[PDB]
Amino acid sequence: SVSIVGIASRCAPHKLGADELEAIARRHYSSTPSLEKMLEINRKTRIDHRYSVFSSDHEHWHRPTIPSFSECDSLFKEYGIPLASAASARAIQDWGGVPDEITHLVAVTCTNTAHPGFDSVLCRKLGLKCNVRRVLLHGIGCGGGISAMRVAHELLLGSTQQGVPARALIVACEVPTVFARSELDIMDKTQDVNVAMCLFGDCAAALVLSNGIGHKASEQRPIWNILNCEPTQFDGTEDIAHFNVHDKGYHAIIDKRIPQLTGKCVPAGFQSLISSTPSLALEEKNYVPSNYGWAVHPGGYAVLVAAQDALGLTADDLRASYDAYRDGGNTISTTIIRILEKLRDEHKHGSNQKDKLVLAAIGHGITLETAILTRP
Amino acid sequence: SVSIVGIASRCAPHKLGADELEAIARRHYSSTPSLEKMLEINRKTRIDHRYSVFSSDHEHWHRPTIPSFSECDSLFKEYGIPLASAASARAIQDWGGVPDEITHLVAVTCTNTAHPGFDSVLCRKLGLKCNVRRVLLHGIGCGGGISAMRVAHELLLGSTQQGVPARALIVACEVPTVFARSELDIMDKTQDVNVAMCLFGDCAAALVLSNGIGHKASEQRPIWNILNCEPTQFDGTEDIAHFNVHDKGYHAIIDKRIPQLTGKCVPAGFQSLISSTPSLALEEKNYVPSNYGWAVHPGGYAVLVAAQDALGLTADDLRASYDAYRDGGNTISTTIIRILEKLRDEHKHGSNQKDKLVLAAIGHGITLETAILTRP
Ligand SMILES: CC(C)(COP(=O)(O)OP(=O)(O)OC[C@H]1O[C@@H](n2cnc3c(N)ncnc32)[C@H](O)[C@@H]1OP(=O)(O)O)[C@@H](O)C(=O)NCCC(=O)NCCS
Ligand SMILES: CC(C)(COP(=O)(O)OP(=O)(O)OC[C@H]1O[C@@H](n2cnc3c(N)ncnc32)[C@H](O)[C@@H]1OP(=O)(O)O)[C@@H](O)C(=O)NCCC(=O)NCCS
């Protein structure tokens, strides 16, 4: 089996509560209908705390000009990469192995574009071996954590086929608040309310996966085994979510139809996942969502609610997903790892969890990424 | 074994010769020393033909303003994606299988950033199945073709581990001429000569790979088997090559030290590759470059020469690499596939080639990507 053997996450350090966002908005823009509507919505997201790499007194929030794309890149390098290094180091510490033994690095972000990519820098910071096998995923957004898991899972199975040890570091790093000034400016000029301003926060998170070959005493035993992962792209959904490039960074388009789409896509993806899993596809009970633990990427509050109802679950089933959302908001590709961390921590402290766990996240496409994890 | 079973490429249709580039440059810029130096270098690259998606009368070459990043994205969608669709379709045609049986898609570009990424569009254009397993690689540049091969190779071994059929479509798509207007403008303003203006052309290319499981009569037999792929990142080389984001796209920095670095990195990477290949690592003869066929990404004319001399090879050994460079220039992640295509075509027409073939490409990092292919 391929197993998860290390987990860690690191939210940015500075709170970006509703009062903080309002202060930023009103500092730079006079009252307009879109500004007032955004601020009203901002207080109703049911997010208690979001985090930014930028403190309230940082020039990012006070400067009169919108950051150039080059500045946005430099800010990601300055603030995002250290967050990623820390999360990665901590996941390697959780694993217990040595950086030298990492054979694969699978990285993901949708808040930076660079050549070389941030994964290259991370190899140096962490002291990974010169022949570590890197993949930097692009284009997927909120689907990215599970996507990285899917990719790493199969790469590790490939090493199992060769009979050699493999250990993958998965690293997700997102600094969406870098683009907050640009988004505010676009909202003011167009008067199109952009709820991205209300939902997103900064975070990095990491996993270590193992193919179980060449296990050493220093290594943590499997936390979960990864049984199967399956993506689905849905026709007729292209316009639903976009993160489009422009002169001052990326601009988010978040269609109001996402929660309703979620309610239809998630159960369809679940059925498809189970159907594609030979060890489970034949028994009828395996097609009942309540027979599994669940972790759902919280694209927004209404996304959790839509998934919850459509799958026949309770809010308590998704407690860890609501908790992650409430304390950190939507941190894009990192959120699913934050939720896994919460679930792991609860189990350590005595919680009763089911033996199978389903991960699900809606990403650009529209794509649904899923995975099934099992208790060892 | 994992095998290559389909190959195709498609350069853009419009020639961008020395006269054409000079016409474009002088149309928008009065003479300066850096302009004259660039144009002088341009006629010495030993590239006979480069191609652009933009014809001589296209507004891209006549507009008085520099394209915004949003326009650059739209242009890639308008011109790049069709190029990728055509190359992909042709590779699938070469393979002979059904688009529905493609299990994995591994895509790469360094001339577009989008959410969803261009791979998502390609799935729809080609009619790939809803659960096709996509990866869009980022951050690697000229290393990208071999990088995609490395990733696809391991993913397919992962399916072999599971005992199921796997067929990967690899697609590389590069439209660097989209950024030519921005690059010209930066060169005028800074007076920093940018040889990127002289080297790069537009192209898409594709491979189909198979893990050999569930082989159908309709499918082409292995062209090459992929034995092993090995990347190396070299410390102390970070600033040697960068493709950095800014308001109007990406800007290339091409250090004069690249050919010198190539001459050191390639033999080192070759030795590492063989050392890491169990079926070859023991015999002394296997560490001699002349005992293999070679395909080297032509970063520029001087890069080919540096690799040739350092490996003890002749220009004739690298004939297909020089040929690809001469007719198409540096097409970034697609060039290595163009060379494989040339080598396939020559062999089909009766040429004598060696049993083993090494692919090598210098990419951002600085990274060297390598692969060893064998005749079935
Ligand atoms: C934003 C959100 C937290 C608001 O929660 P709520 O107040 O319970 O939701 P409501 O249905 O009451 O919406 C309240 C207001 O928000 C607006 N709103 C909701 N989603 C919106 C979107 N995507 N864009 C613009 N406005 C939106 C509604 O139009 C409504 O405006 P009104 O008061 O003028 O009628 C909730 O709608 C949500 O979680 N949406 C999903 C966000 C999403 O798609 N996330 C994925 C990002 S990739
Ligand atoms: C550009 C190139 C084709 C020129 O070929 P050449 O004329 O045989 O090479 P030379 O050494 O005679 O160089 C001629 C001029 O080009 C200039 N030049 C070469 N490489 C350069 C670079 N990367 N940046 C700026 N100028 C460069 C030299 O300084 C020299 O200028 P000078 O005539 O004022 O002295 C060749 O240098 C080359 O292939 N370089 C490598 C390109 C590269 O790094 N590719 C990777 C892109 S990722």
Swiss-Prot record, chains A, B:
The gene is csyB. InterPro entries: Chalcone/stilbene_synt_C, Chalcone/stilbene_synt_N, Polyketide_synthase_type-III, Thiolase-like. GO terms for cellular component: type III polyketide synthase complex. Homodimer. It comes from Aspergillus oryzae (strain ATCC 42149 / RIB 40) (Yellow koji mold). This is Acylalkylpyrone synthase csyB. GO terms for biological process: polyketide biosynthetic process. The active site is at 142 (nucleophile), 364. Substrate binds at residues 201-202. Changing residue 252 to F/V: Leads to almost complete loss of catalytic activity. GO terms for molecular function: naringenin-chalcone synthase activity; tetraketide alpha-pyrone synthase activity. Acylalkylpyrone synthase that catalyzes not only the polyketide chain elongation but also the one-pot condensation of two beta-ketoacyl units to produce the 3-acyl-4-hydroxy-6-alkyl-alpha-pyrone (AcAP) scaffold, a precursor of csypyrone B. The enzyme reaction is initiated by the loading of acetoacetyl-CoA onto Cys-142, and subsequent thioester bond cleavage by the nucleophilic water generates the beta-keto acid intermediate, which is placed within a pocket. Keywords: Acyltransferase, Transferase. Induction: Expressed during 1-3 days of culture in DPY medium.
